[PDB]
Coordinates of C-alpha atoms and ligand atoms in Angstrom, one line a residue:
X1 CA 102.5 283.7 -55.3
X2 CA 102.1 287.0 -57.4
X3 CA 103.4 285.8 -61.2
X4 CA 106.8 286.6 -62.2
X5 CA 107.2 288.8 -65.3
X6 CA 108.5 287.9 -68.7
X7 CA 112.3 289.3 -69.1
X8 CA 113.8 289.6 -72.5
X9 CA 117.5 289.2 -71.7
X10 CA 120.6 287.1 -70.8
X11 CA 119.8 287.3 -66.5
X12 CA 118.5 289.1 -64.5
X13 CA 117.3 289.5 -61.0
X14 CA 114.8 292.0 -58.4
X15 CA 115.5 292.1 -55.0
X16 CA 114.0 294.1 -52.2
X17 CA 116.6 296.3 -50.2
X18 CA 115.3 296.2 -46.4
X19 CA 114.4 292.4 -46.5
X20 CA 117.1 291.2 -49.0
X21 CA 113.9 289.2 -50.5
X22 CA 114.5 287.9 -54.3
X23 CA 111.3 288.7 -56.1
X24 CA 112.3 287.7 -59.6
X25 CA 115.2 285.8 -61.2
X26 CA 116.2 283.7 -64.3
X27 CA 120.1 283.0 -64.6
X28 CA 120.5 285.1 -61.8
X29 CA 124.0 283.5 -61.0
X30 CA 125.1 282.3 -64.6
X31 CA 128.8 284.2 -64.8
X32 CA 128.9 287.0 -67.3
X33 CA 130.9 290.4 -68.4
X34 CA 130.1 293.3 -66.2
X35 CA 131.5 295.9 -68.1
X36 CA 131.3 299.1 -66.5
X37 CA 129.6 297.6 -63.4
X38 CA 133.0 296.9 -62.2
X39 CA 132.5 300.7 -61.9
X40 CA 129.9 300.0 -58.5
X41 CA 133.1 298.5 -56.7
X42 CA 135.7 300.7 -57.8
X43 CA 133.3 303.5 -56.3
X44 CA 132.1 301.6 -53.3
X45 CA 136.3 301.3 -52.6
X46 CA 136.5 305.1 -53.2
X47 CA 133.5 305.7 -51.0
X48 CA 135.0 303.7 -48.3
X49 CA 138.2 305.8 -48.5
X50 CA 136.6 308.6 -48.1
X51 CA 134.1 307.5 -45.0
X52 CA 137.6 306.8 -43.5
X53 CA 138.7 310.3 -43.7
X54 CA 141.9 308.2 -45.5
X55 CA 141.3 311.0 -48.7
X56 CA 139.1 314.0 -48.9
X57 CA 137.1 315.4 -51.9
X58 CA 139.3 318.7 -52.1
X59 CA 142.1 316.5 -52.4
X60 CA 144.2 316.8 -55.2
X61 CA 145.7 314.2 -57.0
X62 CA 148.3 314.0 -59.7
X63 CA 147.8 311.7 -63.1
X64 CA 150.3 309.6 -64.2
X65 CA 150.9 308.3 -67.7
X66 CA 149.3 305.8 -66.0
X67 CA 145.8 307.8 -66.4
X68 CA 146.1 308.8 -70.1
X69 CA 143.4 307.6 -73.1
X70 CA 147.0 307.2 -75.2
X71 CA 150.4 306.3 -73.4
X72 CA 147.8 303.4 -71.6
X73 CA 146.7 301.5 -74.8
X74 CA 143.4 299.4 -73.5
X75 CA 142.0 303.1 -72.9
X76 CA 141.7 303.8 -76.4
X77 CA 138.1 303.3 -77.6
X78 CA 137.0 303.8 -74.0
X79 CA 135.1 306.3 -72.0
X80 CA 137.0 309.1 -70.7
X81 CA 137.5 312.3 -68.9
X82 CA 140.5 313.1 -70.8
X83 CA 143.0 313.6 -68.2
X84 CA 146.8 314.1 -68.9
X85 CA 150.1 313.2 -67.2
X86 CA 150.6 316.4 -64.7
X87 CA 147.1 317.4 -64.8
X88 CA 146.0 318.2 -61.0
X89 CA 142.3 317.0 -60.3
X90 CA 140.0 316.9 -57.5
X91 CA 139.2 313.8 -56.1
X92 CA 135.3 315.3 -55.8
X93 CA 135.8 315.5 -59.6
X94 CA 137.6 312.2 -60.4
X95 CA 134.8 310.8 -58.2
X96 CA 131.9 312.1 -60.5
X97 CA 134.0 311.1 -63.4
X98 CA 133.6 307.4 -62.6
X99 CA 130.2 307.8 -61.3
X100 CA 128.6 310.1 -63.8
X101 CA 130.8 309.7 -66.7
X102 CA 132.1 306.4 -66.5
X103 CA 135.6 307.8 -67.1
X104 CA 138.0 305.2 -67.4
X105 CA 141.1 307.5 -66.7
X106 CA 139.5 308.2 -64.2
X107 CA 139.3 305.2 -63.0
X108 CA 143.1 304.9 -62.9
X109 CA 144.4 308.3 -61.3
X110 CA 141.7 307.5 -58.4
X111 CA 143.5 304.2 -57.7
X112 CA 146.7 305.0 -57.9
X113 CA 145.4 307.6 -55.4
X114 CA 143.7 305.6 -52.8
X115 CA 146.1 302.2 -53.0
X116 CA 149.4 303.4 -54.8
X117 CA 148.8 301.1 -57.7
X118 CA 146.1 299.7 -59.9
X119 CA 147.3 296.0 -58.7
X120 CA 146.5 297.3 -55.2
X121 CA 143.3 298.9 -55.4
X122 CA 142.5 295.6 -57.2
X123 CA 143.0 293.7 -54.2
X124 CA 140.4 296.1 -52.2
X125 CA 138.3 295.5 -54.9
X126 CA 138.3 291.7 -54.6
X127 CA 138.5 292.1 -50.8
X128 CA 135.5 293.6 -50.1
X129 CA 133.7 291.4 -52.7
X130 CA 135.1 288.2 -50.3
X131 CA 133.4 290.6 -47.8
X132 CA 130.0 290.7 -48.9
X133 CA 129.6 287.0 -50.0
X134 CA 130.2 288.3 -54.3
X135 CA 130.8 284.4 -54.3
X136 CA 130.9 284.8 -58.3
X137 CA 132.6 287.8 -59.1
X138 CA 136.0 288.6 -59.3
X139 CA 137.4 292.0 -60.7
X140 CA 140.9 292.3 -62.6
X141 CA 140.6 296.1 -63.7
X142 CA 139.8 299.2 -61.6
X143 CA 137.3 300.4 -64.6
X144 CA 136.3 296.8 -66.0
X145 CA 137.7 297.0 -69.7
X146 CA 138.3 293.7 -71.2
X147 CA 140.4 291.2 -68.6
X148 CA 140.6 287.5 -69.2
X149 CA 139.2 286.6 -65.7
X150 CA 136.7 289.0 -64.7
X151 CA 133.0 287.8 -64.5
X152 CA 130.0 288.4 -62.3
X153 CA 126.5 287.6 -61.9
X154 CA 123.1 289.7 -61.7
X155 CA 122.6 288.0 -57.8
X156 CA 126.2 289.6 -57.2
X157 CA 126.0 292.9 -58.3
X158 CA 122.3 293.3 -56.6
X159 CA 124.1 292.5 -53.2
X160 CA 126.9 294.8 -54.4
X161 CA 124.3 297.9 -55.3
X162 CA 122.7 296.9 -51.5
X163 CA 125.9 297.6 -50.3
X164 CA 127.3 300.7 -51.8
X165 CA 123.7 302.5 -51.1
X166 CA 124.1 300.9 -47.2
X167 CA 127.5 301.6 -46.6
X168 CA 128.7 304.7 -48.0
X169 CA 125.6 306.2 -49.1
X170 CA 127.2 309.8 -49.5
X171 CA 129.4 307.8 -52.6
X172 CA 125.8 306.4 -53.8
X173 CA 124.2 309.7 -53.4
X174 CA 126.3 311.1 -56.3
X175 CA 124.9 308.0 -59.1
X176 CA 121.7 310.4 -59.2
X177 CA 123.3 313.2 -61.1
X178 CA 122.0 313.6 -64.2
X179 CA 125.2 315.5 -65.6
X180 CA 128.4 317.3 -64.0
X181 CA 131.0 319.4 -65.8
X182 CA 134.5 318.9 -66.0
X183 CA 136.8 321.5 -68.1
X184 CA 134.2 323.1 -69.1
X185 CA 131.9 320.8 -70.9
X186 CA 128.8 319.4 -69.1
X187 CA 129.0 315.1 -69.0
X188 CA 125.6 313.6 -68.8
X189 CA 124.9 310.1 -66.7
X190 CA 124.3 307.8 -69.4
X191 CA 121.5 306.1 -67.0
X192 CA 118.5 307.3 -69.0
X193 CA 116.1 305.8 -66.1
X194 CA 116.8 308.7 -63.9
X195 CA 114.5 310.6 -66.1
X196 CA 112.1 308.1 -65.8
X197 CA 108.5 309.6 -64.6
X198 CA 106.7 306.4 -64.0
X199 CA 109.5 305.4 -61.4
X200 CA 111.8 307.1 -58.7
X201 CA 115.0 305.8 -59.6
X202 CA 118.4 306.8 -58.1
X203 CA 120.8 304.5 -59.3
X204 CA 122.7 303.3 -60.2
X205 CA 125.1 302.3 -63.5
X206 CA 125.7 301.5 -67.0
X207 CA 127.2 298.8 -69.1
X208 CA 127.9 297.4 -72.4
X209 CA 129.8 294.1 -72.6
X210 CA 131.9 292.8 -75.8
X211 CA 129.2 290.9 -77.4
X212 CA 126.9 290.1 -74.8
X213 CA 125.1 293.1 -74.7
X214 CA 123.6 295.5 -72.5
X215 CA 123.6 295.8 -68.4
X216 CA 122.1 297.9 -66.1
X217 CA 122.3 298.4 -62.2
X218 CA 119.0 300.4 -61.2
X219 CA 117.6 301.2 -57.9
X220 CA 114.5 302.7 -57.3
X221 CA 112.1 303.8 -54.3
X222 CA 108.9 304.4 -53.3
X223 CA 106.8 305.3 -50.3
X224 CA 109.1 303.3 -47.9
X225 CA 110.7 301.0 -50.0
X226 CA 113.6 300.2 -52.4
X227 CA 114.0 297.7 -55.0
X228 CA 117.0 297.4 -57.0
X229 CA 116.9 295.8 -60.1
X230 CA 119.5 294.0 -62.2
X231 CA 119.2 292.9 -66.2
X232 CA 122.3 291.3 -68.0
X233 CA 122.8 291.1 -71.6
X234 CA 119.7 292.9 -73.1
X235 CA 119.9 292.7 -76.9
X236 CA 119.6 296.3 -77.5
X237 CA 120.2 299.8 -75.0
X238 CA 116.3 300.4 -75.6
X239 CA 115.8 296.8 -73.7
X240 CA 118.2 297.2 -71.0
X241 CA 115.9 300.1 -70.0
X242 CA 112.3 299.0 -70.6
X243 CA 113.1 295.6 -68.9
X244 CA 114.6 297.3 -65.9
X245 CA 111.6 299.7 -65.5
X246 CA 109.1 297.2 -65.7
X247 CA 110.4 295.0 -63.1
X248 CA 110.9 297.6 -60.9
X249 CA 107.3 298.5 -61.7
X250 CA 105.8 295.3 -61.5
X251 CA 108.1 294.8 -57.4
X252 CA 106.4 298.0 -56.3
X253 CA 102.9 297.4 -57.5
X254 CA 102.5 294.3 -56.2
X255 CA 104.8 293.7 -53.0
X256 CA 105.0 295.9 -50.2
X257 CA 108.2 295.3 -47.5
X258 CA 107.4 295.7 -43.9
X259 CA 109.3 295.3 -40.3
X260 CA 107.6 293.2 -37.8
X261 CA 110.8 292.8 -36.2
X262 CA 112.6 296.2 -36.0
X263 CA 116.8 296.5 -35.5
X264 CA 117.4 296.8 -31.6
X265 CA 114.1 295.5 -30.8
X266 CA 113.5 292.6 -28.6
X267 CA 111.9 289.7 -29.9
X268 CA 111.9 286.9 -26.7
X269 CA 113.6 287.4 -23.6
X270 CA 115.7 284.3 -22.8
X271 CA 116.6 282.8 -19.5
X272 CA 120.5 282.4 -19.7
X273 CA 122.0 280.0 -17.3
X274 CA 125.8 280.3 -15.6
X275 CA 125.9 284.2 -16.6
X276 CA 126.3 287.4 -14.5
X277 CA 122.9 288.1 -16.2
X278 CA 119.8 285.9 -15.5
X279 CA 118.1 286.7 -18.8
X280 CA 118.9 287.9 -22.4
X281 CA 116.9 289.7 -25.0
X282 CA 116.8 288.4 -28.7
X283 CA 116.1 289.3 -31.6
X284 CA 116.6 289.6 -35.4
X285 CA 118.8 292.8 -35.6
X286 CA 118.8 294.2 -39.1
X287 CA 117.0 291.2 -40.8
X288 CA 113.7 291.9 -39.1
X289 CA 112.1 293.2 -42.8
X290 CA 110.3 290.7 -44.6
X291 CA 108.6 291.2 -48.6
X292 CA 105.1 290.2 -49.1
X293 CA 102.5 290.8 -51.5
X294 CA 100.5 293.8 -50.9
X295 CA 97.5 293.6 -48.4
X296 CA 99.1 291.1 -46.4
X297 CA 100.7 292.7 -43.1
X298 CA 97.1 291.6 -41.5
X299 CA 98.0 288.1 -41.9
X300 CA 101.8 288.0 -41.6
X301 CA 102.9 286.3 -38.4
X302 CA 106.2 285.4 -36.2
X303 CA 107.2 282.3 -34.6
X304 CA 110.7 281.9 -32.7
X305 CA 112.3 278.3 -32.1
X306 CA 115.9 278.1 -30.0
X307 CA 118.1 275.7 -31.4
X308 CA 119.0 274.8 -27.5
X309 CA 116.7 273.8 -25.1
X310 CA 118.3 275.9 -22.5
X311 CA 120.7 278.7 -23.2
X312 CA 124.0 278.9 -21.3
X313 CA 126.9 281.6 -21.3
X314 CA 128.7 283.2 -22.6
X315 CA 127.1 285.0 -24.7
X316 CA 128.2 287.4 -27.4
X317 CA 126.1 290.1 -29.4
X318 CA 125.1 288.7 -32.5
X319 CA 124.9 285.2 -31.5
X320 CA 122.6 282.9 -33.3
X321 CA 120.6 280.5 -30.9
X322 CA 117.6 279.6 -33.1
X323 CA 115.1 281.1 -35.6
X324 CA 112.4 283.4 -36.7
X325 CA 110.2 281.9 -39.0
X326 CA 107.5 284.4 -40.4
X327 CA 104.3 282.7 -41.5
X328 CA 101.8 283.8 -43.7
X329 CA 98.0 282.9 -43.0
X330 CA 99.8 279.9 -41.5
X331 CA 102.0 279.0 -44.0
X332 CA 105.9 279.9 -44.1
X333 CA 107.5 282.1 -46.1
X334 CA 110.9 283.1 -44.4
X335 CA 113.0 282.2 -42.1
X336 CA 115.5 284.7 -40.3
X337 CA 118.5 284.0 -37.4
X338 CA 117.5 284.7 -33.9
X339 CA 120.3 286.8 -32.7
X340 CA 121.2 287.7 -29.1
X341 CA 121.0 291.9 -28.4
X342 CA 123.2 292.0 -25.6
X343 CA 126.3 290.3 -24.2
X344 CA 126.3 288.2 -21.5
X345 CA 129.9 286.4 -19.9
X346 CA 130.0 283.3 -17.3
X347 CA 129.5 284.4 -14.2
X348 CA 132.4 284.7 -11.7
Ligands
LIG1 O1 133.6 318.3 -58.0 C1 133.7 319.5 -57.3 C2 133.6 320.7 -58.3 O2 132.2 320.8 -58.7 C3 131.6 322.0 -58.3 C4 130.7 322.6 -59.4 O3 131.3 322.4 -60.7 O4 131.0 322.0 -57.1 C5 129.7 321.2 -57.0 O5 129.9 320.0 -56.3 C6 130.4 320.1 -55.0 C7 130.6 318.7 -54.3 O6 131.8 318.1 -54.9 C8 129.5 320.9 -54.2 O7 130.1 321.3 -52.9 C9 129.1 322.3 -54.9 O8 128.0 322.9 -54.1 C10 128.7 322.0 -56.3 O9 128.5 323.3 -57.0 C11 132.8 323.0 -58.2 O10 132.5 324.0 -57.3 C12 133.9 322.0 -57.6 O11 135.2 322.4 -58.0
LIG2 O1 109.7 305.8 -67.5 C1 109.5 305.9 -68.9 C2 108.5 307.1 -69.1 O2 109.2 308.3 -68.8 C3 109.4 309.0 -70.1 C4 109.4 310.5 -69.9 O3 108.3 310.9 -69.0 O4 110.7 308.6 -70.7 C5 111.8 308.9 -69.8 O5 112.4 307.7 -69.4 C6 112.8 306.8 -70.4 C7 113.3 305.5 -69.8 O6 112.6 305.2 -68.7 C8 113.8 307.5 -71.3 O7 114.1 306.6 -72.4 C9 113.2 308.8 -71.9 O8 114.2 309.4 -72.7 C10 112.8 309.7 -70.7 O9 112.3 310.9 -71.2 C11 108.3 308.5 -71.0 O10 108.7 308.5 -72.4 C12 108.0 307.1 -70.5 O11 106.6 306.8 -70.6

C-alpha cells in the first residue's frame, strides 16, 4: 500500500499507461458531462483518418453553413475558430483548431469531412468507444455541446487518453502546443498544465460542464513512465489544475512501472500436442508492465499457471491458455493472460 491522496472534486481517477494499473480512484465510473472531452474522440477519429491515409493535412476542406458560430444555433456561446460557409481550410488547421483551440466549428467542417455528415462521424465516435471497452460513455455531438444522452466517466476517458496517445500518437502529439495561429491571431491551449515546471505534461484537454464544473484530461511523463490523470467536476478552473498536478505528482513519486515480461518475449515454452509444432512459446504480449511502489523490482516475482493440463492444437496467436500472476515478496498483486506468441494448426 502507498496512501491514496485526498481529491477535492466530483471523480477522478490515475492510471499508469504501460501497465494500465489504477493507482487512485473515487467515483471513477459515476456517469457525468464530458464537455469538451468529447473533443479526445472526435480527434482520436480524425487521427485515425489520417493514419489511414483516408485524408491528408494539406487537404482542403470546404465549410458548410453547417460549420458557422450563427446559421448553426447551439454554436453560439461556444468556442470557435470562426469559420464561414465557403471558407477553404486545411485540415492540418482544422485539426489544431479542435486540439488547441477547442473550436467547435471546427469540430463540424472536420466531420462533415471525414464521414459526410455529423450523424456519421458520430457513429465512428461511438464505434471505436464499443472498441475500446468505454462501457459508460456514449457521445451524441462531434464537439460535446449540450446533448440529452451524452455522459462519460473518469475510468473512460483515461482508457480513451491511453488510446489516442497509443494509437495515433502523431494526432496526440499536437495536444502539447501551447498556441497555433489561425487568420492571423495566435490561439493559446487552454491546458495551463503544459506550463507546469514541477511536471512534464503533454496532454491532453479541457472541459467545463453546465453546472458540474470543471474537467481535465492530463498526461504526463517521466524517466520511463506515463501517468495520465483524470479529475471531474472540480469546483473552480484553479482546482481542476492543482488536483491534476498533485496526483500526477504523488503517481510518479511514489510508483515506478517496470517490464518483467517484455512484448514478444517468451515467458514458458509449452509442449503442444496434435500440432505440426511440438512446442509453443508463451507469453504476455503487451501486458507484461506491471506498477509497484518504488524500490520494489528486487522483490517483484512471476508465476505462470495453464488453465489446461496439457495444451492441444490449434493454436492461434493471442490465445489465452492460463495466467501470469506477479507476486510481490510473496504476495500477489496482479494477475495478466498467458497468451500464445506463435501459431500452431493440427497436424496433417
Ligand atoms: O496548420 C498548418 C499551417 O501551420 C503552419 C504555421 O502557421 O505550419 C506549421 O505546422 C505545420 C504542420 O501542420 C508544420 O509543417 C510547419 O513546420 C509549421 O510551421 C503553416 O505553414 C501551415 O499552413
Ligand atoms: O506546476 C505548477 C508550478 O509551475 C508554475 C510555473 O513554474 O506554474 C505554472 O503551472 C501552473 C499550473 O500547473 C499554472 O497555473 C501557471 O500559470 C504556470 O506558470 C508555478 O507557479 C507552480 O509552482
Amino acid at each position: 500500500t502507498v496512501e491514496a491522496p485526498s481529491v477535492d472534486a466530483r471523480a477522478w481517477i490515475l492510471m499508469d499507461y504501460a501497465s494500465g494499473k489504477v493507482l487512485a480512484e473515487g467515483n471513477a465510473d459515476e456517469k457525468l458531462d464530458p464537455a469538451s472531452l468529447t473533443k479526445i474522440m472526435t480527434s482520436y477519429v480524425v487521427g485515425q483518418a489520417l493514419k489511414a491515409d483516408k485524408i491528408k493535412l494539406t487537404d482542403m476542406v470546404t465549410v458548410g453553413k453547417d460549420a458557422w458560430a450563427t446559421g448553426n444555433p447551439a454554436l453560439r456561446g461556444s468556442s470557435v475558430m470562426f469559420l464561414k460557409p465557403g471558407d477553404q481550410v486545411s485540415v492540418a488547421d482544422l485539426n489544431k483548431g479542435v486540439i488547441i483551440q477547442s473550436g467547435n466549428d471546427a469540430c463540424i467542417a472536420l466531420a462533415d469531412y471525414v464521414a459526410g455528415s455529423q450523424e456519421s462521424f458520430i457513429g465512428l465516435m461511438n464505434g471505436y468507444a464499443k472498441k475500446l471497452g468505454l462501457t459508460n460513455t456514449t457521445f451524441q455531438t462531434v464537439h460535446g455541446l449540450d446533448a440529452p444522452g451524452q455522459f462519460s466517466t473518469a475510468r473512460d476517458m483515461a482508457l480513451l487518453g491511453k488510446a489516442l496517445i497509443h494509437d495515433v500518437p502523431e494526432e496526440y502529439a499536437i495536444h502539447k502546443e501551447k498556441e497555433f495561429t489561425f487568420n492571423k491571431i495566435r490561439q493559446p491551449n487552454r491546458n495551463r498544465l503544459l506550463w507546469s515546471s514541477n511536471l512534464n505534461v503533454d496532454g491532453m484537454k479541457t472541459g467545463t460542464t453546465a453546472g458540474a464544473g470543471y474537467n481535465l484530461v492530463a498526461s504526463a511523463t517521466q524517466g520511463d513512465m506515463r501517468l495520465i490523470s483524470v479529475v471531474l467536476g472540480a469546483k473552480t478552473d484553479r482546482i481542476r489544475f492543482n488536483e491534476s498536478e498533485k496526483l500526477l505528482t504523488w503517481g510518479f513519486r511514489f510508483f515506478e512501472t517496470v517490464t518483467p515480461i517484455k512484448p514478444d518475449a517468451t515467458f514458458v515454452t509449452q509442449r503442444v500436442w496434435f500440432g505440426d509444432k511440438s512446442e509453443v512459446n508463451l507469453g504476455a504480449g503487451e501486458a507484461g508492465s506491471v506498477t509497484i511502489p518504488r524500490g520494489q523490482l528486487k522483490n517483484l516475482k512471476a508465476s505462470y499457471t495453464l488453465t489446461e493440463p496439457q495444451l492441444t492444437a490449434p493454436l492461434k496467436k493471442g490465445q489465452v491458455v492460463g495466467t501470469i500472476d506477479f507476486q510481490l515478496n510473496g504476495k500477489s498483486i496482479e494477475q495478466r493472460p498467458l497468451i500464445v506468441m506463435e501459431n500452431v494448426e493440427e497436424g496433417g
